[PDB]
Every structure is written in structure tokens, then in C-alpha cells.
Design a protein around this nucleic acid. Structure first.
Length: 49
DNA sequence: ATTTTGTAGCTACTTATACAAAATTCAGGAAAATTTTTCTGTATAATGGGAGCTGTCACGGATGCA
């Protein structure tokens, strides 16, 4: 649980978004993530993605 | 034949009363003491702020219009 909580990275935050003010297709696997962001990986709750 | 029962009895004898001032304390007052809260001034000169945020909607309006 650590590691994965260090090398976690996040989109939100001051500078980021909010959950609301950003919806969906901004949560998806832009095909550039490949190799760079485990797509398998996400809370959910709203925070998916 | 004493003993317990008596009866005819009191006196002692002791609650009972009620008052009662005396205590005897208590409360409140009053300060008065003082601690804490307020009030006021200040002289070179001084003259427009902060922020950012930037990804729905809807609708009805949208007057505004060209």
C-alpha cells in the first residue's frame, strides 16, 4: 500500500480540476497513457479516472 | 402462709406546654477596594486592491437583432 501510494499520481488538486467541474472524457484512457499509467487502476467512487 | 393478688392508695415523679429569650448563626449590603475595562492621542509625510478563473445547463430568454 505504500508504494502504490507513493507512486500514485493525481489529477485533482489545486491547479487541477474538481470532480464536478470535470466530467468524463477527461477520465479516459487516452491512448497515450499506454505505458504510462496503469489503466487498471483506480479507485472508484467518483474518482474513477 | 407467702405470695401474689389488691385496692385503694398516696406520693414522688416525670413527662408535656408553651414561651422564650436568648443564642446563634446567616445573608445581604454595603463598601470599599481594586482590578479591569474603556477612552484618546499621536504631528516630517504618506493619497486606488486582489485575483485568475478560465471544461455541464438551460432556459428561458433572448432582448436584441440584423
Amino acid at each position: 500500500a505504500e508504494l502504490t501510494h507513493k507512486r500514485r499520481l493525481s489529477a485533482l488538486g489545486p491547479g487541477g480540476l474538481t470532480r464536478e467541474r470535470a466530467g468524463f472524457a477527461v477520465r479516459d484512457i487516452h491512448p497515450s497513457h499506454y505505458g504510462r499509467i496503469c489503466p487498471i487502476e483506480t479507485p472508484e467512487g467518483p474518482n474513477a479516472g
